[PDB]
Amino acid sequence: SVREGELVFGVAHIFASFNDTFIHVTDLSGRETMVRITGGMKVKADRDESSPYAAMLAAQDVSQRCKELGINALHIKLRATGGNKTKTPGPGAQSALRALARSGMKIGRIEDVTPIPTXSTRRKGGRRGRRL
Amino acid sequence: MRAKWKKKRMRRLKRKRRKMRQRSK
């Protein structure tokens, strides 16, 4: 029930970890999932689930599925792992966002929604940290 | 040997003496 020209906005929750990438599209309330493609669904090796190439493929599948449901615009909510873990988005965030823009989807308001503690629980690894 | 671990070795050795001497009292 959308006339030509009108934009039907969805919300794309992009979770770009350093081990995998999620491209989860919902409605404005985030309570109705439309499509959810992860980088692990587009590669065979675990080492490539977070790669930008895997994120590009996942974004192309999300864009195609959105057009079927009448969604042509997306709000972007990017996040890293957050909490007491890394706050830096993974290597698939830029690739996923660029791929959506190059598939007919009109990008709306972009926002970073990484969970930031206002203090926090103790981080893993011990006081000497991860020793490599 | 690292001084901390040499200190640990001596303390273990003192416990045994403390126990090897109180055994006969």
Partner: protein, 98 residues
């Protein structure tokens, strides 16, 4: 041999400073000793601004920025090249570089 007048940290007239956890490895480090860098960059990389700006759904919209404060332990700052080993004379220069 004492290498630095500040002892490698920044603490005067106080006993204890609570530690922070290295952003890279999670090592505990006193806040006054950790190497701190405040990174501000566009949430969209320069390699994708053109594509995202063309697909914008608003006549006007300023792309937000990404604010991240990074706190490194000494080992990670040197390994990641955030800081480098300097000569004995250059160690005293406290002004940030160009």
């Amino acid at each position: 041999t004492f290498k630095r007048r500040n002892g490698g940290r920044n603490k005067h007239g106080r006993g204890h400073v609570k530690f922070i956890r290295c952003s890279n490895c999670g090592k505990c480090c006193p806040k006054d000793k950790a190497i701190k860098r405040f990174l501000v960059r566009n949430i969209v990389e320069q390699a994708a601004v053109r594509d995202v700006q063309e697909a914008c759904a608003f006549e006007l919209y300023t792309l937000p920025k990404l604010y991240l404060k990074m706190q490194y332990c000494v080992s990670c700052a040197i390994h990641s090249k955030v800081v480098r080993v300097r000569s004995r004379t250059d160690r005293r220069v406290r002004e940030p570089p160009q």
